[PDB]
Design a protein around this ligand. Sequence first.
Ligand code: ZN
Ligand code: ZN
Length: 44
Amino acid sequence: NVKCFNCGKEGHTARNCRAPRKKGCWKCGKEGHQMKDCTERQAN
DNA sequence: GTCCCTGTTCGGGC
Ligand SMILES: [Zn+2]
Ligand SMILES: [Zn+2]
């Protein structure tokens, strides 16, 4: 299993997901930066 | 793609 960032549902990933993906931060939510970039709750 | 499998956004990898 692998929790898809885009939709949440397991068994597949963000790229695989048959759904339009997110622009901004996946975890924190806020755009203008990715989850990678994020300075908010940056730890995991 | 049933699943793999993660920042850039589809494509081989099994
Ligand atoms: Zn998905
Ligand atoms: Zn963020």
